[PDB]
Design an enzyme around this catalytic site. Structure first.
Site, short mmCIF file in Angstrom:
data_model
loop_
_atom_site.label_atom_id
_atom_site.label_comp_id
_atom_site.label_asym_id
_atom_site.label_seq_id
_atom_site.Cartn_x
_atom_site.Cartn_y
_atom_site.Cartn_z
CE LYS C 125 -1.45 -1.44 3.95
NZ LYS C 125 -1.16 -2.88 4.12
CB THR C 126 3.89 2.35 1.76
OG1 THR C 126 3.26 1.99 3.00
CG2 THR C 126 4.60 3.67 1.93
CG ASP C 179 3.05 5.58 4.85
OD1 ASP C 179 2.06 4.86 4.58
OD2 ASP C 179 4.23 5.18 4.75
CG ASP C 180 2.50 2.94 8.81
OD1 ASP C 180 1.62 2.15 8.39
OD2 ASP C 180 3.69 2.60 8.96
CE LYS C 207 -15.81 15.80 7.97
NZ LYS C 207 -16.51 15.57 9.26
CE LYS C 284 8.10 -4.53 3.49
NZ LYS C 284 7.78 -3.65 4.64
N1 LIG Z 1 2.71 -4.77 -7.91
C1 LIG Z 1 3.25 -4.32 -6.78
N2 LIG Z 1 2.48 -3.61 -5.93
C2 LIG Z 1 3.02 -3.16 -4.79
N3 LIG Z 1 4.27 -3.32 -4.34
C3 LIG Z 1 5.01 -4.02 -5.20
C4 LIG Z 1 4.59 -4.55 -6.41
N4 LIG Z 1 5.63 -5.22 -7.03
C5 LIG Z 1 6.63 -5.09 -6.20
N5 LIG Z 1 6.33 -4.37 -5.07
C6 LIG Z 1 7.24 -4.07 -3.97
O1 LIG Z 1 6.79 -4.79 -2.85
C7 LIG Z 1 7.08 -4.06 -1.63
C8 LIG Z 1 5.76 -3.85 -0.93
O2 LIG Z 1 5.56 -2.45 -0.64
P1 LIG Z 1 5.60 -1.90 0.84
O3 LIG Z 1 6.82 -2.33 1.55
O4 LIG Z 1 5.41 -0.39 0.80
O5 LIG Z 1 4.30 -2.52 1.51
P2 LIG Z 1 3.28 -2.12 2.67
O6 LIG Z 1 1.93 -2.64 2.42
O7 LIG Z 1 3.38 -0.60 2.85
O8 LIG Z 1 3.95 -2.78 3.94
P3 LIG Z 1 3.88 -2.69 5.54
O9 LIG Z 1 2.61 -3.45 5.91
O10 LIG Z 1 5.12 -3.25 6.14
O11 LIG Z 1 3.68 -1.20 5.82
C9 LIG Z 1 7.70 -2.75 -2.11
O12 LIG Z 1 9.09 -3.03 -2.27
C10 LIG Z 1 7.15 -2.62 -3.53
O13 LIG Z 1 8.16 -1.96 -4.28
MG LIG Z 2 3.47 1.16 4.70
#
Ligand SMILES: Nc1ncnc2c1ncn2[C@@H]1O[C@H](COP(=O)(O)OP(=O)(O)OP(=O)(O)O)[C@@H](O)[C@H]1O
Ligand SMILES: [Mg+2]
Ligand SMILES: Nc1ncnc2c1ncn2[C@@H]1O[C@H](COP(=O)(O)OP(=O)(O)OP(=O)(O)O)[C@@H](O)[C@H]1O
Ligand SMILES: Nc1ncnc2c1ncn2[C@@H]1O[C@H](COP(=O)(O)OP(=O)(O)O)[C@@H](O)[C@H]1O
Ligand SMILES: Nc1ncnc2c1ncn2[C@@H]1O[C@H](COP(=O)(O)OP(=O)(O)O)[C@@H](O)[C@H]1O
Ligand SMILES: [Mg+2]
Ligand SMILES: [Mg+2]
EC number: 3.6.4.6
Lengths: 105, 534, 316, 202
Positions: C125-126, C179-180, C207, C284
């Protein structure tokens, strides 16, 4: 033998063979003077020299306490034994440096 | 790219800074060299501010002095950050006025054909710091910045001034001093690499090579190889200690010390001096400390079963991934199990076998009596020091003792938990690596805190759970002989046990002070009470 | 051409359009200096002085960084390993993002737009919000993350957040990423405990509209949505998007094929075992288990990968 | 080859040698050879340990072997008396006694040992710390000075002072073991034993 077979670690049968620093095996499985490699995991291999003693049951290899401590072997554990061949043109040793200490305080 | 002037740095006494010097000169001194004619026809003003940051001892002041001497100028002034705050209004203002006075006088006397007057600050992150926002308990209120700001630019501004600031904490500098027109160029000086260390060593042993005071067995490449994460101000200390070691062999002790005058004719510096000085004298500050592997791995590590090898194998795969992977620069792992099962020793052994040039341990032994506001700062500093290396390793021991967890209520610290949750998922700068290990004994509590979604994996450290494993441990420790071993096995081997290694050592030590014919019964009496049925 | 330089310096102050020129001039005069004993001017290189486009372009790329612009080196620690199309749920998200981006710029009766990305942990998501923001070409972009506020108190986070928002009411079209959201509130299930001073500021900043004629877009990411619904924070947002996990064998094989890790003969063995069940694993965590199984010997990689996948990634 | 019995120190064999090697071994060589090497002298030491274990005795018996002048003892609490002008000036009137020898004969000066006790509240005040740091280290300083510090609490000591260039030698002087006690008793009952005033029972 050449490919490698599964074997069971055992205890050294006699003090003389314990001092010989040679893994004790059965005649039915190997012969005296043959060198083998013992695998305990992908990154754990140790080269030993074999000696034949009657008391060794087939399918097991006996090691002395120093050998078990050096190779991290435990009695009853499974190992992989494969015949090992030396390159005498290169692997023949000229000089060794050995650190010696009293075995018992 | 940009065509740069050709310099040689062996004649100036600087090694490893082949890019910081170039860019600093281009962006701060490439317009003070040209004749004033074209400068006027272009109308280009002059840069009057520079900032330098990095770890201590890496050669910032040396660079400033060399640059000042390169452009013929007066002796640079010097000031200190915390010193200027030792007094109050009516005293520090006079001190401020006592720095720029000569520049003003020369500007009045000469005009547009004057000489540059460099000024060198130090620890400028104290006066130029309103950042008292950190820590629940901290407050700052200062007004010393504004006078300096007014002097630098504005009314009665000087065209023949240049201010160079130095600091170790780049993130505590107020953003009012960085706008375009006051401290506009920034630079970082970092730890040298192998080539830089070779250059520094070749620069600092050049006056003895001229006079044939250096032996023939001294090879410098091996010295460069053996000194990893050494600053530039510690290779100098190494050379000085290696020199002072050799001059001691040629002294004769009598009623009053005097020189040999017979063996002083062949004064030579040998490889032995350098090796002895590296083993005894110099202790780097961003290197591995070898005095912390004897307090944690106390009685070695023996192999009492199968589970004691899986842990080590898994630890090796994680080390080989934090060093060879480009998709995962940061990894984490948690070691867990019931108390007394031997978790700290295994983590310490894994760290020691890692072989990285930086290894650090965070323990609650060093924080007895602290508040949470100080524990946060200590932990943050420990983590900050790990981002200056290209390969690091940090151990965190007793995660449940950092939070102050007591089952009654329950109570804990919510200012440390959030910081620890945020520091486990922050990656190092550039292309650097990092590996974190952590040991805990209460995994369910950590689960209720959502703290297992921060780590990448986990490893289980189990207890002894069979008679055969107990007999193997006894045989490996070598305390009870065969006569008593058979007796012990005739009873223990018919059931299952539940005992940790630490408790086993304690019991074996306790049951050895009795008379030689009661020890075997005392051992079993103790074992029955402690653990014989899970 | 001074006309072309006036279209690239967006959100530049007047005091930085002066620093740009000075930097270009200083760069131009470097090509005509010499130093043998002490720096001295070459007397044949100071005549043909002509400041050229290349100097301006180099100074613009390297030396000047506006304070009200896009910091193009901070959505580089967030989109780390890229974006790949393992399945359908990616295009849907990337299309809703562009629809919202166009609404916030071509609409007159809605100058403020909000959105929330929610899903299970590790689902990516990030790295999707950063991509959605990076492809909008708005002059101003900023990211508010909790890892630049370690050790801060409750009253020192509100001030930082409010400053980030106040800088965005000075630009004609902006974008902010929060974020978060659960790490800003200092939420712990035991208790529960959190900050009611940051929550009440966040509920109001979502808002309040910017001054007349200006526009703003806000993106937020979280994983514990069931908690924000009890705080009444789902009424402050205008829309929600679900970012899912991988949930079939075919999606897993497609994801593996695009990363290009296992061989053709090593992908049939995996397919035989995997294509008899359903999986639940996030993108991830599927890159952490493909790097631990590549550190083994070439003849035991597939077995280790399958064992690791079985130990954790079972059905929902 | 030291003769420790004659000096009057027992139980300190690996400390005296190390201190002499690291801090004093260059000040018994002619300036001519020391110039051909580029070596710079050390101008700081830190000794810590329990009180009454032989730290001042060592310092004063090592400064007489070199044939230097008497050490100038100074206390910690005394310096911080009232304020600047009575303490800062009093700080000035210590290095001053030797600030001249350098401005008259420079090199070939003798070596002034400036003992300085406590050093654990003075540097927790900040005025004294800054003055001392500027005096020992900086652009202006004397090359005929050696400062020795003593403390009983090692941790409270600041870290800005324990860096290369500053006080860079640390030594611990702890309680003596069996052999140390034996040698000390041998040393302290030598006059009587020579006059036959010590019974054979002892
Ligand atoms: N199709 C994709 N969509 C999202 N992320 C992807 C994709 N392909 C590869 N990635 C990579 O997978 C990783 C997942 O992203 P990220 O670490 O921001 O996840 P997150 O949901 O924010 O995690 P957390 O729950 O730890 O906050 C990142 O390195 C992103 O670059
Ligand atoms: Mg995140
Ligand atoms: N696998 C092992 N084999 C043999 N000895 C071991 C092993 N692991 C640890 N030891 C030794 O046993 C003791 C282990 O104690 P340790 O400090 O690891 O305890 P712990 O698990 O952290 O317990 P605590 O609950 O008290 O924190 C140390 O003496 C260590 O040397
Ligand atoms: N890059 C370098 N090359 C050669 N010597 C260096 C270098 N960096 C530091 N030194 C040595 O360290 C000594 C003091 O370093 P200094 O510049 O005072 O550190 P800091 O930058 O923290 O002020 C100098 O006398 C110098 O000889
Ligand atoms: N190693 C030693 N050998 C002989 N006498 C010693 C030794 N250590 C201490 N003493 C004696 O004990 C006293 C130590 O005093 P001093 O060294 O000044 O104490 P402090 O350690 O507080 O400076 C002196 O009388 C000295 O003669
Ligand atoms: Mg422990
Ligand atoms: Mg004294």
């Amino acid at each position: 033998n050449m490919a490698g077979r599964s074997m069971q670690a055992a205890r050294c049968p006699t003090d003389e063979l314990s001092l010989s620093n040679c893994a004790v095996v059965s005649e039915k499985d190997y012969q005296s003077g043959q060198h083998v490699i013992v695998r305990t995991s992908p990154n754990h291999k140790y080269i030993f020299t074999l000696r034949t003693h009657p008391s060794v049951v087939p399918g097991s290899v006996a090691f002395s306490l120093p050998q078990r401590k050096w190779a991290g072997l435990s009695i009853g554990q499974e190992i992989e034994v494969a015949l090992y061949s030396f390159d005498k043109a290169k692997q023949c040793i000229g000089t060794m440096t050995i650190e010696i200490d009293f075995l018992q305080k | 790219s940009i065509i740069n002037p050709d310099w040689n740095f062996e004649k100036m006494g600087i090694g490893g800074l082949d890019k910081e010097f170039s860019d600093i000169f281009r962006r701060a001194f490439a317009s003070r060299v040209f004749p004033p004619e074209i400068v006027e026809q272009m109308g280009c003003k002059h840069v009057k501010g520079i900032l330098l940051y990095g770890p201590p001892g890496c050669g910032k002041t040396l660079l400033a002095r060399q640059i000042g001497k390169m452009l013929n100028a007066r002796e640079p002034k010097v000031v200190n950050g915390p010193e200027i705050l030792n007094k109050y209004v009516g005293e520090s203002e006079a001190n401020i006025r006592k720095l720029f006075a000569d520049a003003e006088e020369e500007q009045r006397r000469l005009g547009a054909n004057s000489g540059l007057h460099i000024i060198i600050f130090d620890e400028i992150d104290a006066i130029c710091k309103q950042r008292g926002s950190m820590a629940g308990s901290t407050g700052v209120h200062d007004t010393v910045v504004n006078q300096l700001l007014s002097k630098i630019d504005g009314v009665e501004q000087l065209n023949n001034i240049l201010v160079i600031g130095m600091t170790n904490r780049p993130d505590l500098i107020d953003e009012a001093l960085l706008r375009p027109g006051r401290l506009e160029v920034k630079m970082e000086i970092g730890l040298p690499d192998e080539k830089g260390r070779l250059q520094i060593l070749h620069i600092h042993t050049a006056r003895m090579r001229g006079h044939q005071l250096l032996s023939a067995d001294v090879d410098i490449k091996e010295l460069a190889v053996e000194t990893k994460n050494f600053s530039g101000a510690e290779l100098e200390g190494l050379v000085r200690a290696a020199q002072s070691t050799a001059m001691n062999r040629h002294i004769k002790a009598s009623t009053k010390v005097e020189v040999d005058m017979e063996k002083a004719e062949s004064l030579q510096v040998t490889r032995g001096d350098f090796l002895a000085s590296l083993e005894n004298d110099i202790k780097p500050a961003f290197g591995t400390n070898q005095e912390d592997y004897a307090s944690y791995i106390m009685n070695g590590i023996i192999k009492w079963g199968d589970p004691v090898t899986r842990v080590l194998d898994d630890g090796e795969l994680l080390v080989q991934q934090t060093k060879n992977s480009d998709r995962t620069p940061l990894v984490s792992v948690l070691l867990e199990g019931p108390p007394h099962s031997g978790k700290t020793a295994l983590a310490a052994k894994i760290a020691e076998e890692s072989n990285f040039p930086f290894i650090k341990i965070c323990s609650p032994d060093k924080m007895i009596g602290f508040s949470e506001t100080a524990k946060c700062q200590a932990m943050k500093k420990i983590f900050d020091d790990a981002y200056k290396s290209q390969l690091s390793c940090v151990v965190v021991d007793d995660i449940e003792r950092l939070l102050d967890y007591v089952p009654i209520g329950p109570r804990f610290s919510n200012l440390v938990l959030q910081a620890l949750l945020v520091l486990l998922k922050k990656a190092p700068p550039q292309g650097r690596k990092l590996l974190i290990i952590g040991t805990t004994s209460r995994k369910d509590v950590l689960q209720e805190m959502e703290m297992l979604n921060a780590f990448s994996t986990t490893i289980h450290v189990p207890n002894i759970a069979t008679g055969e494993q107990l007999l193997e441990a006894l045989e490996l420790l070598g305390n009870f002989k065969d006569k008593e071993r058979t007796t012990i096995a005739q009873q223990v081997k018919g059931k299952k046990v539940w005992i940790g290694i630490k408790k086993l050592l304690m019991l074996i030590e306790m049951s050895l002070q009795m008379d030689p014919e009661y020890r075997v019964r005392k051992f079993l009496a103790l074992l029955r009470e402690e653990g014989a049925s899970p």
